[PDB]
Design a binder for this molecule. Sequence first.
Ligand code: NA
Lengths: 145, 146
Amino acid sequence: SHPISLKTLVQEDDIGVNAPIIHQSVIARLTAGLYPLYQSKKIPFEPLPETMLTEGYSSPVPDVLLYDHQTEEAKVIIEVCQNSGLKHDTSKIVKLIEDNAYGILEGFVFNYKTQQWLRYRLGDGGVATNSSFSEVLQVDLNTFV
Amino acid sequence: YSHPISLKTLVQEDDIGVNAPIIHQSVIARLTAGLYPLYQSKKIPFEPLPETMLTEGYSSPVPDVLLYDHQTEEAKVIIEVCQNSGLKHDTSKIVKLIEDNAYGILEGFVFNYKTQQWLRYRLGDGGVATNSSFSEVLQVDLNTFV
Ligand code: NA
């Protein structure tokens, strides 16, 4: 199990200067947790951290994405809040999914301070819900953090 | 675990030279993922962290992967991932981060994914890097993960 829980890291971050470390730790946790499912062929998409969707200056760069090498598209994206709001950042992922540019089917936002998750699925009319379950991957993403 | 696509295959397939962003981040993912269970199991004491700031500000260096000592709040091992065009830069960078700064870094590595070659630099080796993938700090061959 994790040598240091997210709860402990958050409890110890009195001045808030550890936020970047905690954020990258979540990225590490998700990437490391998902990777063996990919290598074992349980999931078809490669987990990739901090990967640009395009070469544009303004390209989105999701904290974690699930990449389909065959179609050259990200199918699931995960954003970890960092000194930012869960709700705010979710309104952002919804637009990314509903504008249909990138082939993204599902998105998540995780607030590491409260360990709360929001999910959005393409086709859900712009309304997000409180879920950590990926229907694309068939896994509970909260299990990895 | 075997990698579904080898780095060799990825590079072979990118004749046209436009897939560097994906290949580079895949290397980060493989190193982070490969090392993480050693940290979880307490075989190594340092957390593998991708693209993490060494210090405060937009001035901070950000190596591709580092091994973080949560007790001293320092990176003890850093890894840069490059292709040929960045090799000279990244070799100079790891030496300077280790010898011209006080970040607590004991070892640095450059992995060139185009050639799949490793270089190592150890604090105190007088600026001279060698062609090794073995971390003495971790007692681990980093090449086993890529
Ligand atoms: Na790099």
